[PDB]
Amino acid sequence: MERKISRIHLVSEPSITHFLQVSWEKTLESGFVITLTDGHSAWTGTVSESEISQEADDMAMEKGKYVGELRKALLSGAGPADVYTFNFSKESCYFFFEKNLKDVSFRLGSFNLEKVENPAEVIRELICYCLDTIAENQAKNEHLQKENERLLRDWNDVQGRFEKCVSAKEALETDLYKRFILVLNEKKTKIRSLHNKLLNAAQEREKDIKQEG
Amino acid sequence: MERKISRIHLVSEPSITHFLQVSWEKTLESGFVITLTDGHSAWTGTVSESEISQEADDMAMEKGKYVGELRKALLSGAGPADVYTFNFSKESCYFFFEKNLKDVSFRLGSFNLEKVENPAEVIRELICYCLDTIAENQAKNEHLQKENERLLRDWNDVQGRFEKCVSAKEALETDLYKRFILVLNEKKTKIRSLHNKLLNAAQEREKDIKQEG
Amino acid sequence: ARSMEQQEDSLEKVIKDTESLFKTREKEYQETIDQIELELATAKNDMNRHLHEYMEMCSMKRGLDVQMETCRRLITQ
Amino acid sequence: ARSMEQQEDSLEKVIKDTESLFKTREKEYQETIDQIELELATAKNDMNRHLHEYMEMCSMKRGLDVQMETCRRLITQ
């Protein structure tokens, strides 16, 4: 069982704000209960599945397209610039609503909402539902907010650990170049020693020639 | 300006559920407005800052501790097993509440809530607040849920990219061992060739001895 | 003529000459043997150099190995 | 006695003997020179081997270098 509570403005009573509480299960097409209230009285009507078909057929509109217009008008899920006008007569207890365009108005529904005997019981249940919903929402806030504090601390752990891989890798590549130079200098020191050995041999040869004759 | 709407059960009217809408700014100590309603009538009273001090002093309770008991009793933020009892007399319009222990009951408050002339206007504003709060909460849901879809796709990108570092590193260490073996086998092939050279020299020596005498 | 004198003095010369060549060809053999056994000892040291050089690289990369494994433990979860 | 015969035949012998030793000591010098210039050419090749062996290691690690840098770009943000 679902429900939706929406704020509307009747042109019969334009000064204040009314409320529509539409409840259905599991889809809006299979019928729904609709209630109008001004914080004092309450009018409730049950729109069956057959009445939804009849309302669409009497205006030659495809059902699926019409049921889609109920959700847009009664469940506060449309526009801008989807304009809707709502009428209610407390004498006949008929609820009228229509979608207004610049050149044509589609009379979408005419529902009979008989006045309830105890409107306070309905208003209280409506407020209990809103308070329960607020409590559920703030619980999902705290549970989702907690997942980000964990997801961001998992990210901060990887960030600090990967920068240790980068520093270790750099310290490795530095030690590889140090080991390469230390060995390269030994081989240059050996070549330099062989050069002096070749130089010494040629010098000690000239002495042996100048003395032997 | 803040507010809190809470469900209470009066022992005067135990059958139904009432509602308390407490509003304050910026703290509950500086005074607050408290309203009781049953979805039909509404009683509202303003408890000034001086009245909160007087209520605590008349029971010799420290103010800070007493203001803390108002939040626990009037703002639905306590227990279990914090038990509270609420009384209201529609004749005197006095709101009584007390904290009940197994051996003592602390009469915490006695507020005068005069009956309002238009309770429907108050009930409508209360429902408009709950609907606005639900809309705000579901927006924070969608914005926090979207951050996890991004945080988890950032995590899934690092996970796939780091496993490419691991596979590249493994492919490197494998190619380092392949290069090491390829060179090590050449040096073993050279030593094996020098062994046969030493063997060949000793064999060709025995032939030169057997023939020369 | 002194026949035995000539035959003996000539026999003693060929024995002296062949022995001199005998020792010389033995020394030349030892010289080539010492040449190969030295060249083999240097190729053997060059091979252990090539081994220790790789074993030293593995010993130095252990620090990076530990860090990379530690990081993949935090990610594969 | 034939004085000039003895003096000349002896002078020609010392000139022949000293020249023979002259060429021999020159060959022994070239042999030691060729020995050092060869040993220096091998140490020179061992040094370029040590260079190319390191330059080859850097050329192979480029793949890991690119991946590690790419990963730190995704994390430092």
Swiss-Prot record, chains A, B:
What is the recorded phenotype of mutating K72E?
Abolished interaction with NHEJ1/XLF. Abolished ability to bridge DNA
Query: Changing D82E: reported impact?
Result: In SSMED; impaired ability to repair DNA double-strand breaks
Q: How is it modified after translation?
A: Phosphorylations by PRKDC at the C-terminus of XRCC4 and NHEJ1/XLF are highly redundant and regulate ability of the XRCC4-NHEJ1/XLF subcomplex to bridge DNA. Phosphorylation by PRKDC does not prevent interaction with NHEJ1/XLF but disrupts ability to bridge DNA and promotes detachment from DNA.
Effect after changing R161Q:
In SSMED; no expression of the protein is observed; complete loss of function in DNA double-strand break repair
Which compartments is it annotated to reside in? Nucleus; Chromosome
Q: In the UniProt record, does the keyword Metal-binding occur?
A: no
Per the UniProt entry, the effect of K65E is: Strongly decreased interaction with NHEJ1/XLF. Abolished interaction with NHEJ1/XLF. Abolished ability to bridge DNA. Abolished interaction with NHEJ1/XLF
Output the GO biological process annotations, alphabetical, semicolon-separated.
Answer: base-excision repair; cellular response to lithium ion; double-strand break repair; double-strand break repair via nonhomologous end joining; immunoglobulin V(D)J recombination; positive regulation of ligase activity; protein localization to site of double-strand break; response to X-ray
Under the GO molecular function aspect, what terms does this record hold?
DNA binding; enzyme binding; FHA domain binding; identical protein binding
How is expression of this protein distributed across tissues? Widely expressed.
Which Gene Ontology cellular component terms are annotated? cytosol; DNA ligase IV complex; DNA-dependent protein kinase-DNA ligase 4 complex; nonhomologous end joining complex; nucleoplasm; nucleus; site of double-strand break
Q: Which disease is it linked to?
A: Short stature, microcephaly, and endocrine dysfunction: A disease characterized by short stature and microcephaly apparent at birth, progressive postnatal growth failure, and endocrine dysfunction. In affected adults endocrine features include hypergonadotropic hypogonadism, multinodular goiter, and diabetes mellitus. Variable features observed in some patients are progressive ataxia, and lymphopenia or borderline leukopenia.
Q: What is this protein called?
A: DNA repair protein XRCC4
- Give the organism, scientific name: Homo sapiens
Q: What is the lineage of its organism?
A: Eukaryota, Metazoa, Chordata, Craniata, Vertebrata
Q: What gene does the UniProt entry assign to this protein?
A: XRCC4
UniProtKB/Swiss-Prot annotation, chains C, D:
The places in or outside the cell where this protein is found are: Nucleus; Nucleus, Nucleoplasm; Nucleus inner membrane; Nucleus matrix
Expressing tissues: Ubiquitously expressed.
> Where are the annotated coiled coils located?
11-57
The UniProt-reported impact of C71R is: Loss of interaction with XRCC4, loss of localization at the sites of DNA damages and loss of ability to immobilize broken ends
XCCR4 binding. Required for localization to the double-strand breaks (DSBs): annotated span: 6-77
Q: Which domain of life is it from?
A: Eukaryota
User: What protein family does this chain belong to?
Assistant: Belongs to the intermediate filament family.
* Protein role: Nuclear matrix protein involved in the immobilization of broken DNA ends and the suppression of chromosome translocation during DNA double-strand breaks (DSBs). Interacts with the nuclear lamina component LMNA, resulting in the formation of a nucleoskeleton that relocalizes to the DSB sites in a XRCC4-dependent manner and promotes the immobilization of the broken ends, thereby preventing chromosome translocation. Acts as a scaffold that allows the DNA repair protein XRCC4 and LMNA to assemble into a complex at the DSB sites.
Describe, as the record does, how this protein assembles with itself and its partners.
Forms a heterotetramer with XRCC4. The interaction with XRCC4 is direct, involves LIG4-free XRCC4 and leads to relocalization of IFFO1 at the double-strand break (DSB) sites. Interacts with LMNA; the interaction forms an interior nucleoskeleton and the recruitment to DNA double-strand breaks.
Q: What is this protein called?
A: Non-homologous end joining factor IFFO1
Q: Which residues of the full protein are shown?
A: 449 to 521 of 559
